[PDB]
Symmetry: C2
Subunit: 662 residues, 2 copies
């Protein structure tokens, strides 16, 4: 249906002379500093509810498909966490006793504080390596080096034990407490908007790349290949080439056992994925392969008779809480900070990926303070940092899992294993439990299948994804996320710097203006051209805007002006001796899609206006709605002759003005 | 004048069903790779003209106010360059003979290649310190250490001379040639758009701290204070505190002479600025103070009788061109690259500041290749890097100066001084020539008077300026520009992330839509609200867009939906036992100012559309002109029920549709 909107042509000064403005409220803080929460108890109840993210999902869960699913998922992820703790405790240069504590207590203190499902809090490989490195740096390997033991030639300088591991555990506990209090003080000032910068392609490249890292770190142990420690740049490539070079000393029995286990478990997993409708409850093959491996190992003695590799070092009993050493908290403060940061990073990553599979968008500051207080509670008990492994969350999400109660039942399993079931999982071959992680890693390995779809949608995000992936693979997960974030910001500033500028034109007998490079049968006003940059004119796209203008108008104002003055001097000297301009009347810049301007932008705009006025060709504008016009008039854009009359509300009004002017 | 534009309401599908598109030209390279310059000689002539920036201003200069002005400016800047060379050659751990060569030959080879006025090519303090550092690292201080000279107790291990300085000069020449060829290969691939990122506030904050740095580096020599070398972080502050701590061993005569000279020269400078109309030619007080200082020094013997400090080390005679050592070019390649980069940076800085005083905007790639070939020509002659000092360009621009011929006459003065006028400027006290730079530094010291103006114009550029200034002062000019560029990109992404969102509304009996938070006496459609985000919906402002929506509509869709389903379950269980929604009908997002979208953006937009559809409240759109709509339909935004009918061309069309629908 048509509509009659007959309205006189309204410029800027012709529109404000009859309307009225609104007095802007400065909102000074000297009297409004107590307007957040003075006496209203509703906001207090709300912030108390949001501070404790346990009364949200626990009073709302449904026990229909909950109990057995979360129980089996928790048992699986608890087995995985026990394996990871027994590995990382030895990797962290500390005695292998506190991995179970770091899998038990942080999970407990996170079950009450923290709203992020499908996350198993515990030790992470790269952060454990960083902890071990910063511990070895501030602690000599030989504390006393007792020279006794009647050696061969000189005094037997045996490495001192007992006190060495005790000091190492004390330093690790102090470091974890420092990282926790630093996470808490970071969550204090509410710096949580950083999560707004982690895009889905960014977290993908990252997760896939990590997947690959945890894949190779499980392959190096499923083959029993003695590899050196590598971190920083080229870490993954160096570990891979070291594995490929030292493939000789490989346990054949352990290798074939791991291969059989990964094959049978991926087969039963794809079978369950195919027959998910017949069998109601997903069969937990994790516990099945675990118990059959323990049975075939205890009944054959795969260690003392075949050298396959088993745990054989399960401790027992808890330890009382010990107070840390405050006098050292300064030294760790020099480095732990950085570690702490990347820790949180890894945390949100193992969330953000799953934010793409389930509508469970989380908040940054809440998870920040949750991980902070969780690592604080990890302190005083000689635990590890409150990170979260990728393999554990993978095995928790792939094998069912609905809420965080899976972590709770995993902690219960770890507790019963450390108090009464230690001798049960003694002959575990460390292979099927290192193969279930590779099995459930398929959910993240298949994430590379979206790159063909991402490229066919927007080549920007696909390039970002592949760049993040390769740069992480090269520079290690520590710097990979930072490099990917910098590249994403660079792509954003490039897309805001290089827009899709096109010349606009009206449709016949109407006032709709569309691009002429994509449509046909349009018409262009004789002597009046339209240009829509569709981008903020900041200090970057200034020369780009000039190039767009001089390419859309056909000519360049500088060259035609200098040629005109040269010809004027020529004809003047010829009279003293004796005797490429386009018919375009004006141009209307459709700079309506601009969101912000700077001082350089308005200066360049004034320079362009003056330069075009010097060629006797006017330059008009378009809908500077509310803020760009105020910022222009505030920066001294109107001084002596340039007024707001040259601007217009709509492009059709400018076209009609240029029409009725001639 | 009114206008009748009666037109039926046009949505997206209602506008493309009668018009036609244009076949997009893919422009494959396999057949268009020879379309740049195949046989047309016009483009060849143009690129030859642009490659040699000497046929532009030289056949165009006007000798009216040119000859004497550029002559005196060149003599002044040549004196300054001789002083800077005699200083930096000693600072670069090389014998003090080649500073005059680095001031003479690079200027010669830049006079023909390079279009950037008010720039004196030569040695720069920080790049000279970097050269000295990278030379001392790859060259031992004691080459042979001849143990002869019948010392006190052991053999007199005198430092080897002759070959030491020769090897140092050879290494410096090889380093300069390597930096030059690296600059050339950088200019090769035409990576010159980096100059598009250096804003005017950025270069101001860079040049004010550089002005303070050259001020303190001239103050440390005008007082004869033995200070240690400092580079990197806290360099300026450390040098300043070292000066303030070692102020004791200060030459009183030299101090009072420098003070008198700076006072009288600033007085005569402000007098000439006041009496510029009376005296046509600006009186070159530089040569006057120089000759009177040489007279009062040669007639009083200020060195051997007063210890004031003079040059007394002016060499004589040129040196034949010597071939470098190629077998070392690899080693310098590890570091020189970085240096080279920052060199170019400093270069463009001493241009960009003056780009604010004169309309002489330059191009990045041309200056890049010019400095490259200039430093290449500096090679084979044992010269320094082709940088440009701030004090030299300051004294060249403040004391007249029109074109680059000032550099040419400065080089001529340096040549005549090194061949025949060496004994003339022997007793120069190194004070008045170190005070003229502080005098002409006022032109850049007064550039801090824009902070209130920039603050009153736009709050962002002033914060950028002050941040760049303080960060440069803290971290040294090497990292200051990089930190300022990163902060500028961060401010850009923040301004594009946090827009000025406002609810829109129409004016009575018209179709103009303006913000309701700034105007009054407007009207809002009963049940229909307008929202204009005025920003690209990328992965950063997604949650910001959600917050804007739920704050403009008053409610939040998630909470009202969960409360509605809870109440539905409640009434259902009550029937089994026995028995805050705003009247807003729909919202029209005026997302017309969007310039680019990503996959996360379109995913979040689809999620918002579905969520609002679940609350029986429709959501409409606005002018997605040409590219955002195509990118949305390419990312799978329309699958089963969401069609392009919900979109509209103008906001008034959407309002009329919502009106006639009910």
């Amino acid at each position: 249906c048509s509509y009659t909107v007959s309205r006189p042509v309204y410029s800027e000064l012709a529109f404000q002379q009859q309307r009225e403005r609104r007095l802007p409220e400065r909102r000074t803080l000297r009297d409004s500093l107590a307007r957040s929460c003075s006496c209203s108890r509703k906001r207090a109840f709300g912030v108390v509810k949001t501070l404790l993210p346990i009364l949200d999902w626990l009073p709302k869960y449904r026990v229909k498909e909950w109990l057995l699913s979360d129980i089996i998922s928790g048992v699986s992820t608890g087995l995985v966490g026990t394996l990871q703790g027994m590995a990382y405790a030895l990797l962290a240069a500390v005695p292998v006793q506190f991995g179970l504590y770091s899998a038990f207590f942080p999970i407990l203190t996170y079950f009450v504080f923290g709203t992020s499902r499908h996350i198993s809090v515990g030790p992470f490989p790269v952060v454990s390596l960083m902890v071990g490195s910063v511990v070895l740096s501030m602690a000599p390997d030989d504390h006393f080096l007792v020279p006794s033991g009647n050696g061969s030639a000189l005094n037997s300088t045996t490495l001192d034990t007992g006190t060495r591991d005790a000091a190492r555990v004390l330093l690790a506990s102090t470091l974890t407490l420092l990282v926790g209090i630093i996470q808490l003080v970071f969550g204090g000032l509410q710096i949580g908007f950083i999560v707004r910068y982690l895009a889905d392609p960014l977290v993908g490249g990252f997760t896939t790349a990590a997947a690959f890292q945890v894949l190779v770190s499980q392959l190096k142990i499923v083959l029993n290949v003695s590899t050196k420690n590598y971190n920083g740049i080229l870490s993954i490539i160096y570990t891979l080439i070291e594995i490929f070079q030292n493939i000789g000393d490989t346990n054949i029995a352990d290798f074939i056992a791991g291969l059989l286990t990964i094959i049978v478990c991926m087969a039963v997993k794809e079978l369950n994925d195919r027959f998910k409708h017949r069998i109601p409850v997903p069969i937990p093959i994790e516990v099945i392969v675990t118990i059959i491996a323990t049975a075939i190992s205890y009944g054959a003695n795969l260690e003392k008779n075949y050298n396959a590799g088993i745990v054989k070092s399960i401790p027992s009993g808890f330890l009382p809480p010990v107070l840390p050493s405050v006098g050292l908290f300064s030294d760790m403060l020099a480095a732990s900070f950085s570690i702490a940061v990347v820790a949180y990073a890894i945390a949100v990553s193992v969330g953000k990926v799953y934010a793409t599979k389930h509508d469970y968008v989380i908040d940054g500051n809440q998870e920040f303070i949750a991980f902070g207080i969780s690592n604080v509670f990890s302190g005083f008990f000689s635990c590890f940092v409150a990170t979260t492994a990728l393999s554990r969350t993978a095995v928790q999400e792939s094998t069912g899992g609905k809420t965080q109660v899976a972590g709770l039942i995993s902690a219960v399993i770890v507790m019963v294993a450390i108090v009464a079931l230690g001798r049960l999982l003694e002959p575990l071959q460390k292979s099927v439990l290192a193969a279930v992680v590779i099995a459930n890693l398929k959910g993240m390995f298949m994430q590379v299948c979206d790159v063909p779809r991402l490229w066919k949608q927007n080549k920007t995000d696909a390039v970002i994804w592949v760049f993040t992936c390769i740069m992480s693979i090269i520079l290690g997960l520590d710097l990979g996320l930072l490099a990917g974030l910098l590249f994403a910001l660079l792509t954003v500033v490039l897309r805001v710097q290089f827009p899709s500028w096109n010349g606009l034109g009206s449709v016949p007998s109407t006032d709709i203006y569309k691009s002429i490079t994509h449509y046909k049968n349009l018409e262009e006003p004789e002597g009046v051209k339209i240009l829509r940059f569709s981008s903020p004119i900041f200090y970057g796209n200034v020369d780009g805007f000039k190039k767009c203008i001089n390419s859309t108008v056909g000519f360049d104002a500088i060259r035609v002006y200098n040629k005109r003055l040269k010809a004027l001097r020529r004809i003047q000297k010829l009279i003293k001796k004796g005797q490429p301009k386009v018919p375009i009347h004006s141009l209307v810049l459709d700079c309506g899609a601009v969101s912000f301007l700077d001082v350089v932008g308005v200066r360049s705009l004034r320079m362009i206006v003056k330069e075009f006025q010097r060629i006797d060709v006017n330059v008009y504008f378009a809908l500077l709605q509310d803020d760009v016009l105020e910022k222009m008039e505030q920066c001294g854009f109107f001084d002596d002759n340039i007024r707001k009359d040259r601007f217009f509300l709509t492009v059709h009004d400018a076209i009609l003005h240029l029409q009725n002017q001639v």
